Amino acid sequence: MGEAPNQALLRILKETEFKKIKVLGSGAFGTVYKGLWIPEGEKVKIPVAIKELREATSPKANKEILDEAYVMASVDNPHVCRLLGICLTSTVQLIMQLMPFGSLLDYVREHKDNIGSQYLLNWCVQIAKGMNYLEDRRLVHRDLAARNVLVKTPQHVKITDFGRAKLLGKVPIKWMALESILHRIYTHQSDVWSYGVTVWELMTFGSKPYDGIPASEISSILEKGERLPQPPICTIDVYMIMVKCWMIDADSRPKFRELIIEFSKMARDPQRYLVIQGDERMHLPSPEDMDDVVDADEYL
Ligand SMILES: CO[C@@H]1CCN(c2nccc(Nc3cc4n(C5CCC6(CC5)OCCO6)c(C)cn4n3)n2)C[C@@H]1F
Ligand SMILES: [Cl-]
Ligand SMILES: [Cl-]
Ligand SMILES: [Cl-]
Ligand SMILES: [Cl-]
């Protein structure tokens, strides 16, 4: 025992236990469907996202989806997405929890006129909680960004996208720490950098970081000492935390546990820390042969 044994269970599901209802999106990875999973013998209906392979089943693609599935089967935290199982059909399918409100990036862009300070600062806490869990599990995420946080409810977000994640190419330069761009060094403290950019995406309502700058210049821009600008809604309190995440010395950046502490202090008095016009009034969502629908988080 030099590392501890990963005693996670990989569950293999029959195709007959589930049904695809609509497509939620498609890329070069394949297709995410909305479905229901109904495990045999249990009077339980579980809403799922089924990520099917690209149909072009291929040793390289099949390798990489199973690496993602390895990590997603191995995590268990309220702010991290878990895999429910695999189906080993001709195109392999990962069965995941449905996060019905989508990515947090798209959510902030769509709902900006009704997102208030309490929600933004609570999202920051939740992402810091889930990243602190990944640090405990010894996983460096390597692709933290507001695209890769999903919304179960507006009150409940989870980190996803474990397809870069590593223990202990085309790359997302504008979320990466300087050591990662220059030297390929990745650490928990380089995910802290990306957390800073992620918070910046949220507090700017989904604005693109470094918009217009070619990715070759980013490393030189950063070496010269420039960072992303203070979002309009942000007090110096919140923005100084973003700045601290973007220090050159990685050990001078905050820990995820300290981000939990700081953002949760701020979340007890939101309007002292983010200034949003109309904040006091803003009210967001809180939610069909569907008697036996249980969410995956209650199906242990
Ligand atoms: C491209 O591989 C990723 C792997 C991670 N993923 C995921 N993990 C754990 C649960 C879950 N659940 C879910 C996803 C969605 N979506 C979208 C979100 C945005 C989207 C299309 C699917 O995924 C990213 C690109 O575009 C919607 C409208 C409802 N739910 N519920 N998804 C989403 C992808 F599969
Ligand atoms: Cl692990
Ligand atoms: Cl801006
Ligand atoms: Cl200001
Ligand atoms: Cl601090």
Coordinates of C-alpha atoms and ligand atoms in Angstrom, one line a residue:
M1 CA 0.0 0.0 0.0
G2 CA 1.7 3.1 -1.3
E3 CA -1.5 4.8 -2.3
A4 CA -4.7 3.5 -0.8
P5 CA -6.9 1.1 -2.9
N6 CA -9.7 2.6 -4.9
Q7 CA -12.7 0.5 -3.7
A8 CA -15.2 2.3 -5.9
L9 CA -17.9 0.1 -7.6
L10 CA -18.3 0.4 -11.3
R11 CA -21.9 -0.6 -12.1
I12 CA -22.8 -2.0 -15.5
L13 CA -26.3 -1.3 -16.7
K14 CA -28.5 -3.1 -19.2
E15 CA -29.7 -0.9 -22.1
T16 CA -33.2 -2.1 -21.3
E17 CA -33.1 -0.4 -17.9
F18 CA -33.1 3.1 -19.4
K19 CA -34.7 5.2 -22.1
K20 CA -33.5 8.2 -24.0
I21 CA -36.2 11.0 -24.2
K22 CA -34.4 13.9 -25.9
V23 CA -31.0 15.0 -27.1
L24 CA -29.4 17.6 -24.7
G25 CA -26.4 18.3 -26.9
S26 CA -23.9 16.8 -29.3
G27 CA -20.2 17.3 -30.1
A28 CA -17.2 15.3 -31.3
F29 CA -17.5 13.3 -28.1
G30 CA -20.9 11.9 -29.1
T31 CA -24.3 12.9 -27.8
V32 CA -25.7 13.7 -24.4
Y33 CA -29.3 12.6 -24.0
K34 CA -31.9 13.2 -21.4
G35 CA -33.2 9.9 -20.2
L36 CA -34.9 8.0 -17.4
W37 CA -33.1 5.1 -15.7
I38 CA -35.4 2.5 -14.1
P39 CA -33.3 -0.1 -12.4
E40 CA -34.8 -3.6 -12.6
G41 CA -36.5 -4.7 -9.4
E42 CA -36.8 -1.2 -7.9
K43 CA -39.9 0.9 -8.3
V44 CA -37.7 3.9 -8.9
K45 CA -37.3 6.3 -11.8
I46 CA -34.0 8.2 -12.0
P47 CA -33.6 11.1 -14.4
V48 CA -30.3 10.8 -16.1
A49 CA -28.0 12.3 -18.6
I50 CA -26.7 9.5 -20.9
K51 CA -23.5 10.4 -22.7
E52 CA -23.2 8.1 -25.6
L53 CA -19.9 7.7 -27.5
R54 CA -19.4 9.2 -30.9
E55 CA -20.8 6.2 -32.7
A56 CA -17.4 5.9 -34.3
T57 CA -16.3 3.5 -31.6
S58 CA -12.6 3.5 -31.7
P59 CA -9.8 2.4 -29.3
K60 CA -8.6 6.0 -28.7
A61 CA -12.1 7.3 -27.9
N62 CA -13.1 4.2 -25.9
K63 CA -9.9 4.6 -23.8
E64 CA -10.6 8.3 -22.9
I65 CA -14.3 7.9 -22.1
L66 CA -13.4 5.1 -19.7
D67 CA -10.7 7.3 -18.0
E68 CA -13.5 9.9 -17.4
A69 CA -15.7 7.1 -16.1
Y70 CA -13.0 5.8 -13.8
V71 CA -12.8 9.2 -12.1
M72 CA -16.5 9.9 -12.1
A73 CA -17.1 6.5 -10.4
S74 CA -14.5 7.2 -7.8
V75 CA -15.8 10.5 -6.5
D76 CA -18.6 11.0 -3.9
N77 CA -19.4 14.5 -2.8
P78 CA -22.5 16.9 -2.9
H79 CA -20.6 19.3 -5.2
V80 CA -19.1 16.8 -7.6
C81 CA -20.9 14.9 -10.3
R82 CA -20.8 11.1 -10.0
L83 CA -21.2 8.3 -12.6
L84 CA -24.2 6.1 -12.0
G85 CA -22.9 3.4 -14.3
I86 CA -21.8 2.3 -17.8
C87 CA -23.6 0.4 -20.5
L88 CA -21.4 -1.7 -22.7
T89 CA -23.2 -1.6 -25.9
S90 CA -21.5 -1.2 -29.3
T91 CA -21.1 2.4 -28.6
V92 CA -20.4 2.6 -24.9
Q93 CA -22.7 4.9 -22.8
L94 CA -21.9 6.7 -19.6
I95 CA -25.1 7.1 -17.4
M96 CA -24.8 10.3 -15.3
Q97 CA -27.2 12.3 -13.1
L98 CA -29.4 14.8 -15.0
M99 CA -28.4 18.4 -14.0
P100 CA -31.6 20.0 -15.5
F101 CA -30.6 23.6 -15.6
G102 CA -27.5 23.0 -17.6
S103 CA -24.0 24.6 -17.2
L104 CA -23.5 27.4 -14.8
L105 CA -21.8 29.5 -17.6
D106 CA -24.9 29.4 -19.8
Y107 CA -27.1 29.9 -16.7
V108 CA -25.4 33.1 -15.7
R109 CA -25.6 34.4 -19.3
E110 CA -29.3 33.6 -19.6
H111 CA -30.4 34.7 -16.1
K112 CA -28.2 37.7 -15.3
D113 CA -31.1 40.1 -14.7
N114 CA -32.3 37.9 -11.8
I115 CA -29.1 36.6 -10.3
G116 CA -28.3 38.2 -7.0
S117 CA -25.3 38.3 -4.7
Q118 CA -26.5 35.5 -2.4
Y119 CA -26.6 33.1 -5.4
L120 CA -23.2 34.2 -6.7
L121 CA -21.4 33.9 -3.4
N122 CA -23.1 30.6 -2.6
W123 CA -22.0 29.2 -6.0
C124 CA -18.4 30.2 -5.0
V125 CA -18.7 28.3 -1.8
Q126 CA -20.1 25.2 -3.5
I127 CA -17.4 25.1 -6.1
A128 CA -14.7 25.6 -3.4
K129 CA -16.3 22.7 -1.4
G130 CA -16.2 20.4 -4.4
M131 CA -12.6 21.4 -5.4
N132 CA -11.5 20.9 -1.7
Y133 CA -12.9 17.4 -2.0
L134 CA -11.0 16.7 -5.1
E135 CA -7.9 18.0 -3.3
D136 CA -8.6 15.6 -0.5
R137 CA -9.0 12.8 -3.0
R138 CA -5.7 13.9 -4.5
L139 CA -7.2 14.7 -7.9
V140 CA -6.1 17.8 -9.8
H141 CA -9.0 18.6 -12.1
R142 CA -7.0 20.5 -14.8
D143 CA -10.1 22.0 -16.5
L144 CA -12.0 24.0 -13.9
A145 CA -14.2 26.6 -15.6
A146 CA -17.8 27.8 -15.4
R147 CA -18.6 25.6 -18.4
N148 CA -17.7 22.6 -16.3
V149 CA -20.0 23.4 -13.3
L150 CA -23.5 22.2 -13.8
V151 CA -26.7 23.3 -12.1
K152 CA -28.9 20.7 -10.4
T153 CA -31.0 23.5 -9.0
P154 CA -30.1 27.3 -9.0
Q155 CA -29.4 26.6 -5.3
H156 CA -27.2 23.6 -6.0
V157 CA -24.2 23.3 -8.4
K158 CA -21.7 20.5 -9.0
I159 CA -18.3 20.3 -10.7
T160 CA -18.0 18.0 -13.7
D161 CA -15.8 17.1 -16.7
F162 CA -13.1 14.7 -15.4
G163 CA -11.6 14.2 -18.8
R164 CA -8.4 16.0 -17.9
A165 CA -8.2 14.9 -14.3
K166 CA -5.1 13.4 -13.0
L167 CA -3.8 12.2 -9.6
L168 CA -1.2 13.9 -7.3
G169 CA -2.6 19.0 -26.9
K170 CA -5.4 21.5 -27.1
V171 CA -5.6 23.1 -23.6
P172 CA -7.6 25.8 -21.9
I173 CA -4.9 28.5 -21.9
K174 CA -7.1 31.3 -20.5
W175 CA -8.0 29.4 -17.4
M176 CA -4.5 28.0 -16.8
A177 CA -1.9 29.0 -14.3
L178 CA 1.3 30.3 -15.6
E179 CA 3.4 27.3 -14.6
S180 CA 0.8 25.1 -16.5
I181 CA 1.2 27.2 -19.7
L182 CA 4.9 27.5 -19.5
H183 CA 6.0 24.2 -18.0
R184 CA 3.0 21.8 -18.0
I185 CA 3.1 21.9 -14.2
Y186 CA -0.3 21.1 -12.7
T187 CA -1.1 21.1 -9.0
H188 CA -4.1 21.7 -6.7
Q189 CA -2.9 25.3 -6.6
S190 CA -3.1 25.6 -10.4
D191 CA -6.8 24.6 -10.0
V192 CA -7.0 27.6 -7.6
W193 CA -6.0 29.8 -10.5
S194 CA -8.7 28.4 -12.6
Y195 CA -11.1 28.9 -9.7
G196 CA -10.2 32.6 -9.8
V197 CA -11.0 32.7 -13.5
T198 CA -14.2 30.7 -12.8
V199 CA -15.3 33.2 -10.1
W200 CA -14.5 36.0 -12.6
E201 CA -16.7 34.4 -15.2
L202 CA -19.6 34.3 -12.7
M203 CA -19.2 37.8 -11.4
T204 CA -19.1 39.1 -15.0
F205 CA -22.2 37.2 -15.9
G206 CA -20.4 34.8 -18.2
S207 CA -18.0 37.1 -20.0
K208 CA -15.1 35.5 -21.9
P209 CA -11.7 35.9 -20.1
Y210 CA -9.2 37.8 -22.1
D211 CA -11.6 38.4 -25.0
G212 CA -9.7 39.3 -28.1
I213 CA -6.3 38.3 -26.9
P214 CA -4.6 35.5 -28.8
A215 CA -3.6 32.6 -26.5
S216 CA 0.1 32.9 -27.4
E217 CA 0.2 36.3 -25.7
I218 CA -1.5 35.2 -22.4
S219 CA 1.8 33.9 -20.9
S220 CA 3.6 37.2 -21.7
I221 CA 0.7 39.3 -20.5
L222 CA 0.7 37.3 -17.2
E223 CA 4.5 37.6 -16.9
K224 CA 4.2 41.3 -17.3
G225 CA 1.9 41.4 -14.3
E226 CA -1.5 42.0 -15.8
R227 CA -4.6 40.1 -14.7
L228 CA -8.3 40.1 -15.6
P229 CA -10.0 43.4 -14.6
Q230 CA -12.3 44.0 -11.5
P231 CA -15.9 43.0 -12.4
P232 CA -18.3 46.0 -12.0
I233 CA -20.3 44.3 -9.2
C234 CA -17.2 43.3 -7.2
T235 CA -16.0 45.0 -4.1
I236 CA -12.3 45.0 -3.6
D237 CA -12.9 42.3 -1.1
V238 CA -14.1 39.8 -3.6
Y239 CA -11.7 41.0 -6.3
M240 CA -8.6 40.8 -4.0
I241 CA -9.4 37.1 -3.5
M242 CA -9.4 36.6 -7.3
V243 CA -6.1 38.4 -7.5
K244 CA -4.7 36.2 -4.8
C245 CA -5.6 33.1 -6.9
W246 CA -3.6 34.6 -9.7
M247 CA -0.3 35.0 -7.9
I248 CA 2.9 33.7 -9.6
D249 CA 4.0 31.9 -6.5
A250 CA 1.5 29.0 -6.3
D251 CA 2.0 28.6 -2.6
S252 CA 1.0 32.2 -2.1
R253 CA -2.4 31.5 -3.7
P254 CA -5.2 30.5 -1.2
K255 CA -6.2 27.0 -0.4
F256 CA -9.6 25.8 -1.4
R257 CA -10.4 25.4 2.3
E258 CA -9.7 29.1 2.9
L259 CA -11.9 30.0 -0.1
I260 CA -14.7 28.1 1.6
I261 CA -14.2 30.1 4.7
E262 CA -13.8 33.5 3.1
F263 CA -16.7 33.1 0.6
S264 CA -19.0 31.8 3.3
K265 CA -18.3 34.8 5.6
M266 CA -19.2 37.0 2.6
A267 CA -22.4 34.9 1.9
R268 CA -23.7 35.9 5.4
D269 CA -23.8 39.6 4.3
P270 CA -24.0 39.4 0.4
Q271 CA -24.7 43.0 -0.4
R272 CA -21.6 44.2 1.5
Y273 CA -19.5 42.2 -1.0
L274 CA -21.3 42.4 -4.4
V275 CA -23.1 45.4 -5.5
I276 CA -25.9 44.5 -7.9
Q277 CA -28.7 46.9 -9.0
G278 CA -32.0 45.5 -7.8
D279 CA -30.4 42.7 -5.7
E280 CA -32.9 42.9 -2.9
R281 CA -35.7 41.8 -5.1
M282 CA -34.3 38.9 -7.1
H283 CA -35.9 35.5 -6.9
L284 CA -34.9 32.4 -9.0
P285 CA -36.4 29.0 -9.8
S286 CA -36.8 26.3 -7.1
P287 CA -38.6 23.2 -8.4
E288 CA -45.0 12.7 -16.7
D289 CA -46.0 9.3 -15.3
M290 CA -43.8 10.4 -12.5
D291 CA -44.9 9.3 -9.1
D292 CA -41.8 7.3 -8.4
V293 CA -39.2 9.8 -9.6
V294 CA -36.3 9.9 -7.2
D295 CA -33.2 12.0 -7.8
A296 CA -29.9 10.1 -8.1
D297 CA -28.7 11.8 -4.9
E298 CA -31.4 10.1 -2.9
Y299 CA -30.7 6.8 -4.6
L300 CA -27.8 5.5 -2.7
Ligands
LIG1 C1 -19.0 16.4 -23.0 O1 -19.1 15.6 -21.9 C2 -19.7 16.1 -20.8 C3 -19.2 15.4 -19.5 C4 -19.8 16.0 -18.2 N1 -21.3 16.1 -18.4 C5 -22.1 15.8 -17.3 N2 -21.5 15.2 -16.2 C6 -22.3 14.8 -15.3 C7 -23.7 15.0 -15.3 C8 -24.2 15.7 -16.5 N3 -25.6 15.9 -16.5 C9 -26.2 16.8 -17.4 C10 -25.6 17.5 -18.6 C11 -26.7 18.2 -18.9 N4 -26.9 19.1 -19.9 C12 -25.9 19.6 -20.9 C13 -24.8 20.4 -20.3 C14 -24.0 21.0 -21.4 C15 -23.4 19.9 -22.3 C16 -24.5 19.0 -22.9 C17 -25.4 18.5 -21.8 O2 -22.5 19.1 -21.6 C18 -21.2 19.7 -21.7 C19 -21.3 20.3 -23.1 O3 -22.7 20.5 -23.3 C20 -28.2 19.5 -19.8 C21 -29.1 20.5 -20.5 C22 -28.7 18.8 -18.7 N5 -27.7 18.0 -18.2 N6 -27.6 17.1 -17.2 N7 -23.4 16.1 -17.4 C23 -21.8 16.8 -19.5 C24 -21.2 16.2 -20.8 F1 -21.7 15.0 -21.0
CL2 CL -8.6 8.1 -6.9
CL3 CL -16.0 42.9 -17.9
CL4 CL -16.9 48.5 -7.7
CL5 CL -7.0 34.5 2.0

